[PDB]
Design a protein around this ligand. Sequence first.
Ligand SMILES: Nc1nc2c(ncn2[C@@H]2O[C@H](COP(=O)(O)OP(=O)(O)OP(=O)(O)O)[C@@H](O)[C@H]2O)c(=O)[nH]1
Ligand SMILES: Nc1nc2c(ncn2[C@@H]2O[C@H](COP(=O)(O)OP(=O)(O)OP(=O)(O)O)[C@@H](O)[C@H]2O)c(=O)[nH]1
Ligand SMILES: Nc1nc2c(ncn2[C@@H]2O[C@H](COP(=O)(O)OP(=O)(O)O)[C@@H](O)[C@H]2O)c(=O)[nH]1
Ligand SMILES: Nc1nc2c(ncn2[C@@H]2O[C@H](COP(=O)(O)OP(=O)(O)O)[C@@H](O)[C@H]2O)c(=O)[nH]1
Ligand SMILES: [Mg+2]
Ligand SMILES: [Mg+2]
Lengths: 134, 23, 430, 431, 42, 427, 426
Amino acid sequence: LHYFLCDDTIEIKELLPALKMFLRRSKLPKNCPPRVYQPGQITDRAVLNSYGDFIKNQADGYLFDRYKLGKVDQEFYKDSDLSLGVTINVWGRKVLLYDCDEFTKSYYKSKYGIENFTSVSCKKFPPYNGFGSE
Amino acid sequence: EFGQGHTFGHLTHDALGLSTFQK
Amino acid sequence: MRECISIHVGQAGVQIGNACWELYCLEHGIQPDGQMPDSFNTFFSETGAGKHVPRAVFVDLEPTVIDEVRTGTYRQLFHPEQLITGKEDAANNYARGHYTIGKEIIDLVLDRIRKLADQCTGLQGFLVFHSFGGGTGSGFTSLLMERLSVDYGKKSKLEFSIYPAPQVSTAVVEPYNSILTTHTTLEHSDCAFMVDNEAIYDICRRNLDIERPTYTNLNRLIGQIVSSITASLRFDGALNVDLTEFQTNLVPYPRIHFPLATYAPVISAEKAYHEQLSVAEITNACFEPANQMVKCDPRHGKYMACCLLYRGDVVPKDVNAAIATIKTKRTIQFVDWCPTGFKVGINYQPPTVVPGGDLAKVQRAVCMLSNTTAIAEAWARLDHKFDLMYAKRAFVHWYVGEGMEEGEFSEAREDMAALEKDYEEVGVDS
Amino acid sequence: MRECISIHVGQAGVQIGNACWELYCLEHGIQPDGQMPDDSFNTFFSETGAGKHVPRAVFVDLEPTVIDEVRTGTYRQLFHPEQLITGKEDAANNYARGHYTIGKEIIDLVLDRIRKLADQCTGLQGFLVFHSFGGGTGSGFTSLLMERLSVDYGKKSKLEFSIYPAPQVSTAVVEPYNSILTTHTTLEHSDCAFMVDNEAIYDICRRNLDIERPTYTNLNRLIGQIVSSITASLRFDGALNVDLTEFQTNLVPYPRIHFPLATYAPVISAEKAYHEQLSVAEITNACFEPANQMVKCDPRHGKYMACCLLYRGDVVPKDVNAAIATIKTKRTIQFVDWCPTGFKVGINYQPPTVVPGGDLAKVQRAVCMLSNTTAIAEAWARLDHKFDLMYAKRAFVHWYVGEGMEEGEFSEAREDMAALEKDYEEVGVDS
Amino acid sequence: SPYSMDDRDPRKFFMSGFTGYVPCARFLFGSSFPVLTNQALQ
Amino acid sequence: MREIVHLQAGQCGNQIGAKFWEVISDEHGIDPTGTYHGDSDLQLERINVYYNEATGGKYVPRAVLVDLEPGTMDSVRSGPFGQIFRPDNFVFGQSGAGNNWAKGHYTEGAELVDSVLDVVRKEAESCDCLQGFQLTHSLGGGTGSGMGTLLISKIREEYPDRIMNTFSVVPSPKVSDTVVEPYNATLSVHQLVENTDETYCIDNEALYDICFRTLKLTTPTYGDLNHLVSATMSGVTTCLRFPGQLNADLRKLAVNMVPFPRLHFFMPGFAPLTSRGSQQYRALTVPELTQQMFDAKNMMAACDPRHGRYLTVAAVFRGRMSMKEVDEQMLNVQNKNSSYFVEWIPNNVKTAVCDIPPRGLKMSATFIGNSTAIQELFKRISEQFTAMFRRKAFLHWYTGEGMDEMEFTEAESNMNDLVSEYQQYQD
Amino acid sequence: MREIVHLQAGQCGNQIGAKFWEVISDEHGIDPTGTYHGDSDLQLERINVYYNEATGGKYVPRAVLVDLEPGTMDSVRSGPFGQIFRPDNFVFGQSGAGNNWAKGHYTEGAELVDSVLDVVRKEAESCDCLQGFQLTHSLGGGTGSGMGTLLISKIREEYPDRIMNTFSVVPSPKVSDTVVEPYNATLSVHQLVENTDETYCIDNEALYDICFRTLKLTTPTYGDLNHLVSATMSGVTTCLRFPGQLNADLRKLAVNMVPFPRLHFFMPGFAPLTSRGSQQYRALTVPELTQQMFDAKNMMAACDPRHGRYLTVAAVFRGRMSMKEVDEQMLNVQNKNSSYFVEWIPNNVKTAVCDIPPRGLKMSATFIGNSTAIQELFKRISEQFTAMFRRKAFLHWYTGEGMDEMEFTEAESNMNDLVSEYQQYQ
Ligand SMILES: Nc1nc2c(ncn2[C@@H]2O[C@H](COP(=O)(O)OP(=O)(O)OP(=O)(O)O)[C@@H](O)[C@H]2O)c(=O)[nH]1
Ligand SMILES: Nc1nc2c(ncn2[C@@H]2O[C@H](COP(=O)(O)OP(=O)(O)OP(=O)(O)O)[C@@H](O)[C@H]2O)c(=O)[nH]1
Ligand SMILES: Nc1nc2c(ncn2[C@@H]2O[C@H](COP(=O)(O)OP(=O)(O)O)[C@@H](O)[C@H]2O)c(=O)[nH]1
Ligand SMILES: Nc1nc2c(ncn2[C@@H]2O[C@H](COP(=O)(O)OP(=O)(O)O)[C@@H](O)[C@H]2O)c(=O)[nH]1
Ligand SMILES: [Mg+2]
Ligand SMILES: [Mg+2]
């Protein structure tokens, strides 16, 4: 599991007894196998209405409001949310983290001040006759 | 479901006091 | 398992490739020695011990530019047989580099290419780096190209050439070697990208605010463009482009395959964060007449086909609104027979910068690949420079002294007259 | 349990065995003292109750200079003291000196030790001979030894590893005489003669190992590697083993057509092993390239006959069959129209072992190929072209008539090799 | 540069095919190019 | 019980279908592993339409994935629901098509269809009673436009009495992202008009305009754009997987909506599309749904229906609703827009009502229209083709790989033959 | 009850039999020590067929292990299941045959067969009711092709009222591991066709193809190819040592698949074959087994069956499973592929059903088949032999041991008669 700190996005590779993929660099939802919402429900900015006049710029032509009415409760995994020895629901799959790399250890002990990372382990002759010399 | 002879030698031999039923 | 093979011929091709392979290692996290503390297959091969080896052949007749790579900081990266050297240079001489010394190591070069080719499970194209005006940059690549054209039939053949600039140039025999190279590029070369020194010089003064650039500044900037067009093979994106299609949808006639390159946004560190660098203005900087990377005026000619290659955080709608913004401008003239001339490409990798460089850390970039008829005026001022050489037969006897005839001068001249009348024929309205 | 006999004759055969028997004691872990610090060594060594192991070779030369180097050298306490037969007067680049007068005095002792060595082995495979054409001892002594071995041991296989003279560089002057007079008896009393040319090893060492100016130690270690490659099947386990007769029936189709080649791959130094990848399909394509061959001939002008491949180390039979299929689809390689099957494959598990201080890298998979080819007819032609020019003036003759040989056998040997060139052309032509 | 580099360092050698001059290299034989140049630099 | 075989060709067809299998797995309660996890049994009585049972209680899709480039198959395996697909159904070439119709249909595509059709046929005798095929592709590429016409030619040559669901992405006038789009469209409509029972036309400009007016989305990326197509993709065949009150399968849709053998290009639509802010302000009722159907901004094609006439209209409802309100409202829209519907056909409108709405909504409806306004989509392609055909630009690439000058004129002639039918019946 | 004697000759026969004695030991639950460690008692009721009882509960295999070169028997004893073989059953010579049929038949393999015949005859009288012989070798070698066909000749003249089931690994053109094997192939099919009743042709190219496209393994070593062969070895006779509902022995297969005394060349198969990464997505059903028995990809011989017509086909099923689905689908494949079977005989398919599937599987099916597509298997050896004997090459190794050149002409004449009869009846 690679967690990029630039975009807070998670990608996964596999280790065949190679790489393949098994996942893509996207945001990982946290709670439950999520339903695919109706379109338009996942936008980032709440808008009131477009400008009434016909001539306008398309990107600018939106007025935003002060109430965010239809917020869906979408929770995404983060560096605080995932740590060592924590069960993670990858799209319905229970995944256990058991060790990590030295840069991850250094980043965690620098940011959150956690000092201990214990790597969880996962795993004549026949008898003789007397008719001759032994 | 959605909701949820022992030996060839001992069978041909060693039959003095034992019958076929006794073996 | 789609691969590209690189050949670097001449001092210009070798020195650009030093910055080109430096960038590729920095893109991918591969250390200079060759290990780590799947997008590598396109340009590297993973050995059993964990080493990674490039897919380039560094060949030149003059050892003094190969030796500085052998003694340089990238000595553990390459294979010691891939770095072919010679005995004496071409010395700015097309006769010397093609038919006097160029035959003595040409079979060595051919077997290394074949030894590299059968290792690749899937081949896609060639990337040849050279310069027009050089002896090795003309003599070696002309001999090399027709042998690979008859060895491999349908493979794409991409070249990157240093155009001798109109006003400024280094050597004197430059008009001769520029004409004598084109008689191979018109038939065996599939798509030859073209760039000059003076336009990179001009951009470094204004955008980067460099008062006194060197070739170290140029080679990094050329390396960014060539790393931007091959990004779709390694990294993923919203819609990717392989080597075959962006030269499919760009070459409409068999003799019109000479595009122009443009990079955006090129900027220094101080002015970048003051600017707003969104999608709607990085593509408008491409079509400014002061930002094209070949010294010519695009307003005189009309655009023929264009390719836009976006990298980083780019929303696909911001591309389409920018294109419709471009098509409403009067100065951006298009040919009537081509209704749609724009090709897009989106990649999910932001650009990177080498440490100790100049370019800023910018979330997005676009590379513009423009086929246009404005390059005819660049060839007219070079054909005129040829005609004053050939009128008084100056510098000729260094060509007949190695065993080659005089009639190829006139044959290449009417070849250039054939090429410059092609643009005037295809540039008219119907 | 399966045992072989090796015979080393002449200064070349002795100097090959200095770097040939070095390899066997190293890879079996046998000390130069002769003691082991479970029967894979029985092919090349015999066990003594004290614990010492004694090799199974004979070292014969007519001058005591080169044996004395071995006798006082590193391997003094390894060879038997009667496996080193000495002679006082060298043959001195003369066929007659080695074959009639001096060689008759010590052949009874040489055949005494051979019969003594043959009676110790419960199961005998055959004989392996190491000598050189251009020397008096390497021509005279082996010619009399083979006619005295074909009388005593009839059905046993005889194989040679000869030093074939180079077209341009040579040591002596009279070797066109001395090479045709020693190949007169090989066409009737030999059965397989692998020939290695010295300057072909020179060009391999120049452009692959990058040794600029090599010497005999570089040559004999490579030749020592090729004999370990051909014999590795009897010594160790594998997917399918190879007998001496198995690659003999696979290589010789005629009573007279028995002249194969030899080539080793991969042959690189240590610093090239890390960068390149030594695939199975690559080490078999280096063998078929003409620049890697150990005889200075062009196989493109020649005509392939029968190829035997011997794989050592971590190999996969699927890769071998794919590699063979890729060999058959290149058209620079041609086969006769009467031998449609032209490949024999042998597999051995053991990878190569490199001596400390050697010029070779640690190789995880290697291959030996043994190709019969009529391209040697080009090499017999120039060897006979340089014979008739120097025979027409009757130069360098008077010792041959003064030491025991009649002159009239000169035309007999020329007639035999003329028919030999005539026989190579009859096999090479199709219907 | 390998010339002034310390002797105990394993990098004190040149790759094969190097046309640059190495002192005390013409007086050496029977060995491969990088180790020959390595002992020449020693 | 009815069986549908799915095929995905090209880059655009693969990503839309990858969103398609994600949507209907959610509707039937299928985990990404392939394990059933639902709440009601009505999603389980008809699962053999799209899925095949495997040992251990795992469900695999009945889809065949093909492209000439291995790059997109690594992405399809990479998806959130990429693990369910059969690895035996992943067939591909090695040389990219390069947006060349000849490189997908004649030169390199002829060496892959021998292996494509074996896997495609292997699912057919695995099925008991086959019904039809769905093939998702784009008309502008060199893979989907070329091989999609090649595959339907080979399928129809040996399944005569079946039906074809060709969900083609048509080229766009201003969102053109390739310079040879008129070439790859005119060379693919030759085989689409003859060997396809119905084709659903989707562009990118009308999808983008929906995302800015009805949905008010700031950044409508491709992962959101493909969801609009996938909703209508799953809404057309709801009568085969769910109980209803007035059922209508694919052949019933074909009989009611195809009056002439070469008029089968449709404009689809989705009714309950809302903006995010107006979720709690809107009354979701049938007249509100019917008003959103026949809105000129809600059709997924770049054709204005006010610039033409309607042949035959269908609407498939999902959820709990009456039948008087459905029939009266969709009779009132016929009387009010009486000039738009043709006078020589009575009862232009066909209704269909199911009983299970999609998850997360009280009711939904899918709108399918056949109109004369689709002639403008083909007119701009033909007049773009002629300007390039006149100067013979980008032509030596096709003719360098087995094509000729002759076949381009026949393709444009069949374009003009197809366009002339719509304007003939308009007046 | 019905004992089968197993004979192993050549290096190929020794390696396959070493794998064969491993699978049936695992099926009957026999550890390499020699005891019995199993759960079900059905593996013990029929145990005398393949294994012999010895004092102390130790079971020993009834097999004969013969090879002139003693190289391979060191590997056999050093294998995982090598302790069970009797040292009195290890009969070997001193020198190898050297890829020569002459030395393997008349000089070096001429005095060892006295020792082989006494072990075979001793084990023959130890059996209660002998059922027949099964033997494994290679035609492309010197010992297996030489002494194998010699032992077929000497046993047939002494046991006339028995059967021979030969499992011959025929050579392939591209996988040609020898240069002389056209001579050995033609000179062994002369002795094969007259003294064998049932012969199974196995190829290496077919096995390498299967492990690539069906099993998807990138390192197919010989320890895996012999496992695929050993599956058909244990599945041909699974109704002789296990209960069922429709039992069939080797004689019933012989009288249902051999209509003529010369048309007895078969082509084997085994088809619950899946990869490791695709086990989750396949339904193990009788329709899916029936589909993949009959395709050209699963045959263990390098022949395309669609270029010819079948004569007889037999299928042996294992597992608790129905019968209408068997009888319908065996009828369905005859009706659909009507042009792939000859029209002058009806009901070309024989079905046999057992009770016990092998370990780690749910149901199994073993395919054996007579076909006229073996013409292409023997035509290539014809053209190889004619173009090679034309110049009399590779011949002094044969005439220097006692045989005249006329035997080469007779072998071509017999084989030309064998390709005449299959083409006549196609
Ligand atoms: N962009 C760029 N161009 C270079 C560089 N080095 C040399 N050139 C070009 O090379 C041209 C002259 O060629 P030469 O200097 O003779 O080098 P060459 O092409 O290898 O030819 P010869 O050295 O004579 O064999 C100049 O006009 C430069 O434009 C460089 O580092 N960057
Ligand atoms: N390749 C190789 N050839 C050797 C070696 N030693 C000797 N020779 C060959 O021996 C030839 C010279 O023969 P001589 O000097 O007469 O030695 P000889 O063959 O033993 O004959 P005599 O000196 O009479 O005993 C040279 O041409 C070499 O080819 C060696 O170590 N390696
Ligand atoms: N809706 C949608 N359209 C796409 C996507 N990817 C590509 N396209 C469209 O497909 C057209 C190009 O098709 P192309 O990829 O060349 O087809 P191919 O060559 O057969 O794979 C462009 O005009 C895009 O608008 C996607 O993910 N979603
Ligand atoms: N498939 C397979 N073939 C084998 C095996 N062992 C040997 N062979 C084949 O046997 C042939 C060589 O036979 P060989 O050992 O020389 O026969 P022999 O000399 O009479 O014992 C080669 O072509 C191999 O393909 C094995 O384990 N599996
Ligand atoms: Mg230079
Ligand atoms: Mg001497």
